Design a protein around this ligand. Structure first.
Ligand SMILES: Cc1cc2nc3c(=O)[nH]c(=O)nc-3n(C[C@H](O)[C@H](O)[C@H](O)COP(=O)(O)O)c2cc1C
Ligand SMILES: Cc1cc2nc3c(=O)[nH]c(=O)nc-3n(C[C@H](O)[C@H](O)[C@H](O)COP(=O)(O)O)c2cc1C
Lengths: 120, 120
């Protein structure tokens, strides 16, 4: 029996690029990515699961945007940022990244949900 | 936004006493219990969340049954055992305990689900 993490998706994120990360594991790795995420970024599941999502950043990603995200995660609050991201073939795209914390019944942080929308 | 852990319940365990535990946390604590569990055992949510479910054991619980459960958890396999358990008022009941592991998409153990059925 495998957990149905998609059963925590918002209605918006169902047909979307979405990632869930486990902040209790070292380096806050992705434990679930939607097929839309894999299609957009050009990776296989094996290439992404268990890694921190920073692999989407590349040579022209703004490091302050990266730090903003890191602080936003520490804040455990909903936030959105436009950040330059890259696919496996090296092509770049502006990603409107939306992140929100998910807590367990006791109120302890449990997961982060991240949704990717390329800005056209 | 709070995780809907009940969205991993089997159809059988919906109207049932059920617990989910987080084995990545120290001492494998309960992170979710159903209202049926609280009613049966006589505890409040605050009294149970974040504790290992061994608080259901009492003076005449068979220690080999306890060890069986512990090994079954290490085995990460489905198992069932009849074990004497106790409510908060000290009354005892024979619990047919059914436990199953739940894994994440990478196949790493993520939760245990435990269902309680008093044997009549
Ligand atoms: C659920 C989740 C989804 C994320 N998605 C992206 C993303 O799509 N693009 C990106 O550049 N960073 C994303 N990140 C951010 C990185 O994983 C990381 O937190 C960021 O680089 C800042 O942390 P760092 O300083 O350790 O690198 C995501 C983080 C989380 C937790
Ligand atoms: C999800 C879950 C549900 C459990 N439910 C019960 C239970 O209803 N009654 C009981 O005696 N033990 C239950 N246990 C077992 C105890 O939590 C514990 O694993 C057992 O006492 C053996 O471990 P120990 O040697 O550390 O005490 C449950 C364990 C898990 C993980």
């Amino acid at each position: 029996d495998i957990a149905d993490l998609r059963a925590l998706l918002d209605e918006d994120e169902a047909e979307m690029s979405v990632v869930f990360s486990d902040p209790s594991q070292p380096d806050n790795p992705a434990i679930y990515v939607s097929d839309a995420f894999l299609v957009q970024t050009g990776y296989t599941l094996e290439e992404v699961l268990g890694r921190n999502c920073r692999f989407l950043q590349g040579p022209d990603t703004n490091p302050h945007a990266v730090e903003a995200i890191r602080q936003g995660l520490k804040a455990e609050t909903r936030f959105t940022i436009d950040i330059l991201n890259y696919r496996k073939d090296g092509s770049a795209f502006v990603n409107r990244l939306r992140i929100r914390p998910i807590y367990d019944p006791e109120g302890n942080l449990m997961f982060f949900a991240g949704a990717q929308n390329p800005v056209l």
